[PDB]
Amino acid sequence: FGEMERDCMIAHGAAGFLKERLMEASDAFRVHVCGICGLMSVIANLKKN
Amino acid sequence: EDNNRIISRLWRSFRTVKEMAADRGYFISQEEMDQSLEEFRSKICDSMGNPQRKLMSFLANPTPEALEKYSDLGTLWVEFCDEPSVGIKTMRNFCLRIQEKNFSTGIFIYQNNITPSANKMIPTVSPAIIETFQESDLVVNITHHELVPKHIRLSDGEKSQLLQRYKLKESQLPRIQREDPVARYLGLKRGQVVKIIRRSETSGRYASYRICL
Amino acid sequence: LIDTAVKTAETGYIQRRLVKALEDIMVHYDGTTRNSLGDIIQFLYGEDGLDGTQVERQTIDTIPGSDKAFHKRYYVDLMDEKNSIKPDVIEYAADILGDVELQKELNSEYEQLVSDRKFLREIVFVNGDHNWPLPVNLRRIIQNAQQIFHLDRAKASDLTIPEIIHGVRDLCKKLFVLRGENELIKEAQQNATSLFQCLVRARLATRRILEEFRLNRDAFEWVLGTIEAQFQRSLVHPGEMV
Amino acid sequence: ELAILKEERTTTPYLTKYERARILGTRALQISMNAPVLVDIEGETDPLQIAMKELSQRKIPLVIRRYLPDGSYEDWGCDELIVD
Numbered sequence: 001f002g003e004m005e006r007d008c009m010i011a012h013g014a015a016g017f018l019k020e021r022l023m024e025a026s027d028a029f030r031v032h033v034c035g036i037c038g039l040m041s042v043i044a045n046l047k048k049n
Numbered sequence: 050e051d052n053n054r055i056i057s058r059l060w061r062s063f064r065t066v067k068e069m070a071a072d073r074g075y076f077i078s079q080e081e082m083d084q085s086l087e088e089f090r091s092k093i094c095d096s097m098g099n100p101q102r103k104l105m106s107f108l109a110n111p112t113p114e115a116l117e118k119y120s121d122l123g124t125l126w127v128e129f130c131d132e133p134s135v136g137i138k139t140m141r142n143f144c145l146r147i148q149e150k151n152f153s154t155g156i157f158i159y160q161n162n163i164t165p166s167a168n169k170m171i172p173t174v175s176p177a178i179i180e181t182f183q184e185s186d187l188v189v190n191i192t193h194h195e196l197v198p199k200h201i202r203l204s205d206g207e208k209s210q211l212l213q214r215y216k217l218k219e220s221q222l223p224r225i226q227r228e229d230p231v232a233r234y235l236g237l238k239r240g241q242v243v244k245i246i247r248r249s250e251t252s253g254r255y256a257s258y259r260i261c262l
Numbered sequence: 263l264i265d266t267a268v269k270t271a272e273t274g275y276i277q278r279r280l281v282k283a284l285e286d287i288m289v290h291y292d293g294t295t296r297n298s299l300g301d302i303i304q305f306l307y308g309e310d311g312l313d314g315t316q317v318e319r320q321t322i323d324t325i326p327g328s329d330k331a332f333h334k335r336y337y338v339d340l341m342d343e344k345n346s347i348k349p350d351v352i353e354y355a356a357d358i359l360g361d362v363e364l365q366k367e368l369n370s371e372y373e374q375l376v377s378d379r380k381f382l383r384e385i386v387f388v389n390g391d392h393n394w395p396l397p398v399n400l401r402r403i404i405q406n407a408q409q410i411f412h413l414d415r416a417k418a419s420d421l422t423i424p425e426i427i428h429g430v431r432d433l434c435k436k437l438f439v440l441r442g443e444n445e446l447i448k449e450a451q452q453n454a455t456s457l458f459q460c461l462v463r464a465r466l467a468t469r470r471i472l473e474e475f476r477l478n479r480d481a482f483e484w485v486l487g488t489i490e491a492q493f494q495r496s497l498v499h500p501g502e503m504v
Numbered sequence: 505e506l507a508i509l510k511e512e513r514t515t516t517p518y519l520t521k522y523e524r525a526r527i528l529g530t531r532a533l534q535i536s537m538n539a540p541v542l543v544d545i546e547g548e549t550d551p552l553q554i555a556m557k558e559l560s561q562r563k564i565p566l567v568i569r570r571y572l573p574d575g576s577y578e579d580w581g582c583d584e585l586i587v588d
């Protein structure tokens with residue numbers, strides 16, 4: 001999905017289709033970040049909450 | 050012979066200086082503007098047929114309308130220099146001459162070049178404003194040219210109204226430079242917005258503003 | 263084959279530079295064409311607010327022609343019989359010759375058209391090329407108004423002149439590109455549409471309505487409404503990465 | 505704080521194509537996950553057809569919030585924007 005096709009889907013204006021093509025249909029990921037320091041260095045554990 | 054071309058250059062330069070002094074808001078009577086050439090040769094050249102620059106200086110007072118619309122406008126002093134390579138000498142004495150009568154703006158036309166050590170002698174004449182120009186520049190009035198449209202400097206408020214209509218800050222406008230011939234033709238300073246009225250072939254008349262630095 | 267092998271990639275890289283240069287210039291909700299951080303590039307998009315797919319080449323009748331033919335086309339004189347509107351095209355042709363009340367109107371309108379002539383001829387289109395892209399196709403609306411209402415013939419009209427002059431004059435001011443009631447918005451609204459007003463005033467003048475198009479009343483109203491509707495449909499859309 | 509009242513609104517009153525697009529999309533997405541439909545449901549079952557059928561007769565309850573450039577905005581009801 002080259003940069004030029006990105007430029008075309010910007011020319012049409014479908015922002016949701018782009019946000020889809022570059023997320024769900026490829027590689028989505030989740031990161032827990034802090035709010036004071038602002039880094040992806042949060043040590044998280046879920047089933048213990 | 051070679052006399053008439055020099056005399057013609059000096060004449061055109063003087064006329065352009067007067068029109069420049071007319072668009073900035075001051076007052077020049079029509080007996081001075083419509084000067085023909087025999088008056089110039091008869092009243093400027095010596096019996097040898099050679100000029101005296103010290104007989105071309107003059108003072109200028111503002112009109113009432115321009116005094117009302119633009120408040121920070123004093124008087125104008127125009128003096129053509131005498132020496133060719135303007136160094137520290139003529140610059141210093143000229144600065145004293147402006148610091149003497151306490152007038153507000155002076156125009157020091159040079160001929161060939163100005164020395165840099167004297168080019169530092171311009172922030173030393175405050176609160177006045179000395180503005181330098183070369184002579185070989187003002188032979189042609191750039192405003193009668195086809196492309197260049199009208200530039201109209203604004204007042205203090207109207208600017209505030211313009212910044213209210215678009216909800217802006219003074220840094221987010223198209224800019225013009227402090228050294229750009231149609232920006233010193235009007236004598237701009239940092240924070241003054243010139244209005245431009247360009248022609249357009251999709252709506253005829255298009256008004257576009259532009260700020261200085 | 264060699265030249266073909268050479269230039270295409272050059273043009274491609276050139277296009278990449280252009281696109282990577284111009285890819286954040288938007289049209290915000292009031293006509294400004296700002297970049298990513300507010301440097302107003304164009305104060306009003308395209309100088310007129312129109313789109314790009316909506317304009318068509320049209321002719322502006324006023325510019326070309328000689329003064330005698332222009333006068334023969336637009337001038338009206340109710341006093342003298344020979345140079346007035348024909349009698350067999352209007353029913354009310356007996357209640358006309360003599361009332362200055364209306365020769366006033368006609369004189370003022372003709373002076374306005376002279377102002378448009380000198381304006382467009384001197385300042386803008388210097389060479390005089392009378393063919394330029396503009397919105398709203400007028401002639402199609404005209405002959406559509408002729409077909410839908412059968413208005414052909416052989417018949418006299420019933421349209422009054424004050425509805426004509428006051429109709430066009432009250433139309434030319436309902437064409438909104440910028441709204442609000444501040445003075446700057448009003449002047450911008452005045453300049454944004456001037457060539458188009460010269461077009462409408464150039465087409466729908468009186469003799470070219472009662473002596474060439476031969477409309478009536480209902481069709482006239484339908485036409486003004488149509489012009490308003492289409493002009494309101496042919497504007498740019500805020501949110502358009504131009 | 506930055507809103508504009510219901511007399512000073514100065515944006516165009518015509519439903520643009522992008523707005524129409526997102527209204528149809530979102531309303532269809534709501535009609536799909538079992539939401540109350542506000543017209544007479546008859547001979548069409550596709551959610552997009554139902555959404556357009558609602559937009560034709562003007563019954564869609566949503567609020568357009570047009571963000572002006574510098575930070576303010578305006579609030580229009582989807583049942584007063586003149587659908588072309």
Ligand SMILES: [Zn+2]
Pocket residue numbers: 034035036037038
């Ligand atoms: Zn932390």
